[PDB]
Amino acid sequence: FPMKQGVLTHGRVRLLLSKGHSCYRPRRTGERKRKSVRGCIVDANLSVLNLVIVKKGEKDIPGLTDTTVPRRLGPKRASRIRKLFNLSKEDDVRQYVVRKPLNKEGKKPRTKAPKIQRLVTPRVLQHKRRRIALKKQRTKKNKEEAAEYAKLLAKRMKEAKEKRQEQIAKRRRLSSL
Amino acid sequence: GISRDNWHKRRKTGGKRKPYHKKRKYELGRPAANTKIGPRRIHTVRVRGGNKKYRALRLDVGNFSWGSECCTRKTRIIDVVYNASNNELVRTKTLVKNCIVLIDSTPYRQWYESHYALPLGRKKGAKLTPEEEEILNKKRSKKIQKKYDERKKNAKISSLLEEQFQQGKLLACIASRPGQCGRADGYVLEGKELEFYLRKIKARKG
Amino acid sequence: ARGPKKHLKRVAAPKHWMLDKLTGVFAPRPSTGPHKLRECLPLIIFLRNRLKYALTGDEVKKICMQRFIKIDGKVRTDITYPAGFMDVISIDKTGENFRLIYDTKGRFAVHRITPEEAKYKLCKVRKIFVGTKGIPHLVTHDARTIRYPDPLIKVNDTIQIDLETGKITDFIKFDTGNLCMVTGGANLGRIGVITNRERHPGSFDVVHVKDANGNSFATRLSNIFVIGKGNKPWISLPRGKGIRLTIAEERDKRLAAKQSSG
Amino acid sequence: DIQTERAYQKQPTIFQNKKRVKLPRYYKNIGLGFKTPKEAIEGTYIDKKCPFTGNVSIRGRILSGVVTKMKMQRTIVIRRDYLHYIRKYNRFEKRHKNMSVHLSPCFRDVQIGDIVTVGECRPLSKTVRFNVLKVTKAAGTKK
RNA sequence: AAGCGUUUACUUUGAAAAAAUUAGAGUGUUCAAAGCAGGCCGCCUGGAUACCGCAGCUAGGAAUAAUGGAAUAGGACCGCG
RNA sequence: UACCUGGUUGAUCCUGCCAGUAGCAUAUGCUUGUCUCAAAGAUUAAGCCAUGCAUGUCUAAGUACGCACGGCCGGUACAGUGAAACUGCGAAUGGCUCAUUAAAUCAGUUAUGGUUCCUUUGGUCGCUCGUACUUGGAUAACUGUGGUAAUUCUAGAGCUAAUACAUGCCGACGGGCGCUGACCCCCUUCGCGGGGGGGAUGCGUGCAUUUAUCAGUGGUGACUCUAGAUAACCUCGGGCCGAUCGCACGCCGGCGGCGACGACCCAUUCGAACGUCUGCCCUAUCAACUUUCGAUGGUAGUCGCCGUGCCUACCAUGGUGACCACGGGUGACGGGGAAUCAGGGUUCGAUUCCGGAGAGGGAGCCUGAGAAACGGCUACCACAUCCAAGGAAGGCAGCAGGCG
RNA sequence: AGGUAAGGGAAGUCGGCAAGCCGGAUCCGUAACUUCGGGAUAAGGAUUGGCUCUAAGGGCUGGCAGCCGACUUAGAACUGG
Ligand SMILES: [Mg+2]
Ligand SMILES: [Mg+2]
Ligand SMILES: [Mg+2]
Ligand SMILES: [Mg+2]
Ligand SMILES: [Mg+2]
Ligand SMILES: [Mg+2]
Ligand SMILES: [Mg+2]
Ligand SMILES: [Mg+2]
Ligand SMILES: [Mg+2]
Ligand SMILES: [Mg+2]
Ligand SMILES: [Mg+2]
Ligand SMILES: [Mg+2]
Ligand SMILES: [Mg+2]
Ligand SMILES: [Mg+2]
Ligand SMILES: [Mg+2]
Ligand SMILES: [Mg+2]
Ligand SMILES: [Mg+2]
Ligand SMILES: [Mg+2]
Ligand SMILES: [Mg+2]
Ligand SMILES: [Mg+2]
Ligand SMILES: [Mg+2]
Ligand SMILES: [Mg+2]
Ligand SMILES: [Mg+2]
Numbered sequence A: 001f002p003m004k005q006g007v008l009t010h011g012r013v014r015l016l017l018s019k020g021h022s023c024y025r026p027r028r029t030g031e032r033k034r035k036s037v038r039g040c041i042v043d044a045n046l047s048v049l050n051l052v053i054v055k056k057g058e059k060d061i062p063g064l065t066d067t068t069v070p071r072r073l074g075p076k077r078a079s080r081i082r083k084l085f086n087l088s089k090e091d092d093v094r095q096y097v098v099r100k101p102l103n104k105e106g107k108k109p110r111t112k113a114p115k116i117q118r119l120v121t122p123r124v125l126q127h128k129r130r131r132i133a134l135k136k137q138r139t140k141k142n143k144e145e146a147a148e149y150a151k152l153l154a155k156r157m158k159e160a161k162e163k164r165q166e167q168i169a170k171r172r173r174l175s176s177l
Numbered sequence B: 001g002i003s004r005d006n007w008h009k010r011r012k013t014g015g016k017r018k019p020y021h022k023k024r025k026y027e028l029g030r031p032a033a034n035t036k037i038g039p040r041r042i043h044t045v046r047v048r049g050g051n052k053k054y055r056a057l058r059l060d061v062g063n064f065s066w067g068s069e070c071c072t073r074k075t076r077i078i079d080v081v082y083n084a085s086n087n088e089l090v091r092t093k094t095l096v097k098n099c100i101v102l103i104d105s106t107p108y109r110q111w112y113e114s115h116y117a118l119p120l121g122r123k124k125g126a127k128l129t130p131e132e133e134e135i136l137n138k139k140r141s142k143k144i145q146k147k148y149d150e151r152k153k154n155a156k157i158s159s160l161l162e163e164q165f166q167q168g169k170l171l172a173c174i175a176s177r178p179g180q181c182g183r184a185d186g187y188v189l190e191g192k193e194l195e196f197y198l199r200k201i202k203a204r205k206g
Numbered sequence C: 001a002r003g004p005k006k007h008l009k010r011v012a013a014p015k016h017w018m019l020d021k022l023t024g025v026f027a028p029r030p031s032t033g034p035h036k037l038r039e040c041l042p043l044i045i046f047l048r049n050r051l052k053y054a055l056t057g058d059e060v061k062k063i064c065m066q067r068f069i070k071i072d073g074k075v076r077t078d079i080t081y082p083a084g085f086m087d088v089i090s091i092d093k094t095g096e097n098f099r100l101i102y103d104t105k106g107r108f109a110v111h112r113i114t115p116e117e118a119k120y121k122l123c124k125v126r127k128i129f130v131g132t133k134g135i136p137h138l139v140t141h142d143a144r145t146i147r148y149p150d151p152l153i154k155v156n157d158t159i160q161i162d163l164e165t166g167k168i169t170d171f172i173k174f175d176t177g178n179l180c181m182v183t184g185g186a187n188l189g190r191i192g193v194i195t196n197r198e199r200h201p202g203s204f205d206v207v208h209v210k211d212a213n214g215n216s217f218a219t220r221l222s223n224i225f226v227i228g229k230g231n232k233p234w235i236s237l238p239r240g241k242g243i244r245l246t247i248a249e250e251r252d253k254r255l256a257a258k259q260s261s262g
Numbered sequence D: 001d002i003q004t005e006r007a008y009q010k011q012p013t014i015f016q017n018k019k020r021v022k023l024p025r026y027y028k029n030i031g032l033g034f035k036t037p038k039e040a041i042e043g044t045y046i047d048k049k050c051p052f053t054g055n056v057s058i059r060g061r062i063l064s065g066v067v068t069k070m071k072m073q074r075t076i077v078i079r080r081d082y083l084h085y086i087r088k089y090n091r092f093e094k095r096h097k098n099m100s101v102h103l104s105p106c107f108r109d110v111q112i113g114d115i116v117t118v119g120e121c122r123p124l125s126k127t128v129r130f131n132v133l134k135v136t137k138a139a140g141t142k143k
Numbered sequence E: 001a002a003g004c005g006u007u008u009a010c011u012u013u014g015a016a017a018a019a020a021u022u023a024g025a026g027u028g029u030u031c032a033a034a035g036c037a038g039g040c041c042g043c044c045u046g047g048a049u050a051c052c053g054c055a056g057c058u059a060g061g062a063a064u065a066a067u068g069g070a071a072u073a074g075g076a077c078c079g080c081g
Numbered sequence F: 001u002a003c004c005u006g007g008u009u010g011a012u013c014c015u016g017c018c019a020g021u022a023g024c025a026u027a028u029g030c031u032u033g034u035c036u037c038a039a040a041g042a043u044u045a046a047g048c049c050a051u052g053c054a055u056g057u058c059u060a061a062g063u064a065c066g067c068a069c070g071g072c073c074g075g076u077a078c079a080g081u082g083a084a085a086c087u088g089c090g091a092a093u094g095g096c097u098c099a100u101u102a103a104a105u106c107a108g109u110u111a112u113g114g115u116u117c118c119u120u121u122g123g124u125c126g127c128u129c130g131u132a133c134u135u136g137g138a139u140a141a142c143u144g145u146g147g148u149a150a151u152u153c154u155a156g157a158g159c160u161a162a163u164a165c166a167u168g169c170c171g172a173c174g175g176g177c178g179c180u181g182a183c184c185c186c187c188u189u190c191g192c193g194g195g196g197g198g199g200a201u202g203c204g205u206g207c208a209u210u211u212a213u214c215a216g217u218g219g220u221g222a223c224u225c226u227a228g229a230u231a232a233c234c235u236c237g238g239g240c241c242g243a244u245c246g247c248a249c250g251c252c253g254g255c256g257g258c259g260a261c262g263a264c265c266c267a268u269u270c271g272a273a274c275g276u277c278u279g280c281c282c283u284a285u286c287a288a289c290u291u292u293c294g295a296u297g298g299u300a301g302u303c304g305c306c307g308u309g310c311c312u313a314c315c316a317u318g319g320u321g322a323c324c325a326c327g328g329g330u331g332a333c334g335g336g337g338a339a340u341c342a343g344g345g346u347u348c349g350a351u352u353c354c355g356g357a358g359a360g361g362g363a364g365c366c367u368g369a370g371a372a373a374c375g376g377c378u379a380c381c382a383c384a385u386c387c388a389a390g391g392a393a394g395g396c397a398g399c400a401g402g403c404g
Numbered sequence G: 001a002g003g004u005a006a007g008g009g010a011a012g013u014c015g016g017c018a019a020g021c022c023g024g025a026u027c028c029g030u031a032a033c034u035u036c037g038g039g040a041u042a043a044g045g046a047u048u049g050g051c052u053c054u055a056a057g058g059g060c061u062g063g064c065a066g067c068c069g070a071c072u073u074a075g076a077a078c079u080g081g
Helices: A078-085 A122-176 B106-116 B132-137 B142-154 B159-167 B191-205 C043-050 C057-065 C247-261
Strands: A012-017 A033-038 A100-102 A110-112 B041-047 B051-059 B061-066 B071-083 B099-104 B169-174 B186-188 C069-071 C088-091 C096-099 C120-130 C136-140 C145-147 C158-162 C167-172 C179-181 C191-198 C206-211 C217-220 C225-228 D062-069 D076-085 D092-102 D115-125 D128-135
Touching (some): B071 B191, B106 B142, B159 B169, B169 B191, C043 C057, C043 C069, C120 C225, C136 C158, C158 C225, D092 D115
Parallel strands (some): D092 D128
Antiparallel strands (some): A012 A033, A100 A110, B061 B071, B099 B169, C120 C136, C158 C167, C179 C191, C179 C225, C191 C206, D062 D115, D076 D092, D115 D128
């Protein structure tokens, strides 16, 4: 049973765990499970103890610090590549992305590079211009439609007011009659 | 949990109806918000249809409107003086719809003095040294002076409101439900309703 | 039922679909759209069972998703798209345009119309709404909410809409003397002029309608669809002209026609 | 008179605190040709469930009944009589339903045993869903 | 042409009232139980109709069955001050 | 097909019942050649279950550095398949069963003017006046150390993206409208005064929410409807005003097409829920019942998607019933229907269609628009699996199959 | 002559002798039988302190105002090992 940080015990206790809680992988969304975890206090009753060395000593231990395993993956986001190689706002980034060479038995050597994400590309620029064109055309069509309705309403209202005026004239005729 | 079931109680004739189904989700009840007075602390709750409801727990300010002159400002609330539902809601300061609370009349006095250029409250014997009221009352141009003279003709206010302004706080009735919307909006009591509630307050005081 | 229903039994399907009983257990459930569940005809039913352009669902899917069918001047890729009353379904490959109009009986009928006629359709306004800035809005029976309408139009009128632009061209006022289509009920398919209107406050009002052969009838407002001013419609009427002749007059005419043909 | 409860009894629509230098009353016509009583317009009471001067709308069905009990406050009980036909024996059964309707104080003088017209509205209480629209006297009883 | 006529039962119509099922139309599943197809030298068509209690709505009738008008005239009608 | 016959007596005419007669079902016995349909563990055990399966899903249009395949035109990223995983959605459909439930469910008729509503379709999406040539860091799949007797159990270390989680702007935008108004100009009076115009500055000025006020564009039979104006509010457990993706690619660094996706609000569709009136088997050896442990109403609140004693606080004593209230039984899911039938009725309806309930018994709940979901979890009772004895894991009234 | 005693609870003794248990008040509830009066405080339950509030129960003077005087009952919050 794994140890859980933030329990302040030394034995075994069952906890309700949800998404975001350690020592639990939910199957469906919202699923919570009763899992028995171990206390965060280290005692003699442990099968395996996890240790992380953060300060290097004077001696070169041949188990951990003797050899440095290179990181398997390189940066993919354009901003992270800029942070890594101290790029500026104007210099291009496509020429500085690290590509991992490929080599094994049989096949030819290969170099593969990840797709750079969130960069300035013509397709993004065209999409931004298209949606700003949609934004301006909506106002243009709304203005034209409003003008057409104003003309139509004016036509209808003047028809109604002259019809009411001749009705009032008939009332005047009745009054004078 | 707590549910609103019309099948859980007796019929019109008084007979007992046995339930034919479990407690459905749509017939649900929730614990009362029980708003208090203090620093604002509002919790959002997921509601049927994916909506959200704002539950207030402690609230300090609210938007109260002066009905006679149509002016409202964000005003802090200090105490609750009356509650027609129960006296426990008076003993423990709880904001509910149709409850009477006390709010300091500073924003109302500032608006009134900046609008009609007349002294509201201001018990005689004191003068403001920083002359912030002096500038707001004086320096009127001659052309606009008759405009303010026209305003001050009808700028008169009731005696009860004048006394409340002199005291520094005035009564108000909350018209919104803090447990639903999260605000404590209300209106200033005036006229017959105000004196009726004053009668209730005086009778309670004894 | 712990939610909305997504299936539809073959037996439970509306009768005017004319669905066979032995073929299957489930009927194609219409997708949600501008027409109700029972007032619509699924596009799979229109192409497979009636037009016989296809045989099974796979063929209907191929036809629909090849972008060949065009309903209301637009292409819908869903097989079970709801096709309702007075809808224009066009197939450009065959140059065939259909207007969904009920025949004398209650079922839908194949009504081929010219491309000149297919450019427009008729809609009945359901309600008038006022927008967030004093903008009048007109809602048709097919969920078309066109704003800035003609002020002369009222609740129970009809309009002619250009499919390409989705804009009104002309309108017909709801009044006595104009033709009306009974698009629902026992008189489904009847065509005749309005001769009387009875007002029943609180309840739904009714209209007495006289046809071209003197067989008057009554219909409530919710099942009325005017189709033009005067005695002439604005659309091409199908065979029968909406009369619903008696059973004996239906029987003898087909017997005489068969005898004449031989 | 008025204002007998803990809260203040007033019409929420009209504004009564307008500066001066009588109180306006809010009322409406319920439609269907029912003429509003003069008492509901010239009175000084308020009522949330009054059909003419309240936040209630009459919609649905219109029924008639005979008032039997007038002990409940702001509501009365009426008895509706009808005949139930049995298919087996070509005769009728005399059955009745006792429903509680909201008697608005606009109708001041009403006795028990008279025909009263009611109309469906929103559910006012647990077993009240109708409001009194008009009142007609019984046989004679004009004294 | 729009609104009003003591209230109902009753009687007739119309409206609305799921399918399948019942009765029933057409139809050589080789007959029938069936099913909704099918027939012609692409065309011609069907996939009808009836009942659906009881309750509610509308429009004709007032024969029969209940109920009121005005009788300490707080009765109509007609105008008046 | 509107149907009878034998039987009490020494014999006769009657009442009277028994037994004969024929369907429709349930099981059984005997026999059984062809062919077309076709019910089939409901009646007792809604009793218990070995086993196997029954819900996963990728399009050019959300993420692709797993050589797991594969092309070379490279050096100005990404050919195209693509396991896995994150992400979005479904899993609340369907199917099985009838245990409970007798104005309850349900059937017919209506209203939400008393509410919500994923998706689809259609409206809106420069309406606001105050680094954008693209903003941030965590994580899976990947590599490596393992633990447990074991599970669809998982930890610690490295990385690495988003239509996952957040921050957040240029533009339209140059000015209008309201208040503020230093000031200025003109007429007239002996004169204060009175009347009429231009205008520095500041603030607010979108839709949606809340609150109060004023007048009454389009409506319903009726609004406290919709719309306009006024003064603010806008929850940090925050609202929208696009920091997305694909196919061909053109015209004067800017304009440009067809789409896909997401989203505040409004109509539409599938519905859902309370609702109005009418209608249900037997039973009086059930005649009064309900009621400050809500019963009938009133007032004001809480909660609820909404209206409602759903609940709270204070008041009135009401509410139903001989027209059968109330209680009890049912070998009672209701109905559309089925058998028998002259006409009238009697009986059945577990059952493929609709509406209701449930997954051994109740209870509680996350997620999600939609569940008090059970092929989802969390407890207790009965049953029950593996075991190292420390623990873990189950619900066939689903399809087959097993026990009783 | 008074008490206290772990675990069992009458196994002691002629015999529950003696001792021990309950015990007041308030709010619920109360059977077999019966002479219908009772059984009955049947049986069986729950609460009880302190402090701070709220509501209700009246006179005298000139549905209103003022001034007085007493004891109670119910409800609520806080708090103590
Ligand atoms: Mg039928
Ligand atoms: Mg004998
Ligand atoms: Mg013999
Ligand atoms: Mg027999
Ligand atoms: Mg053979
Ligand atoms: Mg069984
Ligand atoms: Mg289902
Ligand atoms: Mg049973
Ligand atoms: Mg049963
Ligand atoms: Mg009969
Ligand atoms: Mg059944
Ligand atoms: Mg059974
Ligand atoms: Mg079913
Ligand atoms: Mg079982
Ligand atoms: Mg369920
Ligand atoms: Mg469950
Ligand atoms: Mg199961
Ligand atoms: Mg299930
Ligand atoms: Mg002892
Ligand atoms: Mg002891
Ligand atoms: Mg002994
Ligand atoms: Mg003794
Ligand atoms: Mg005794």
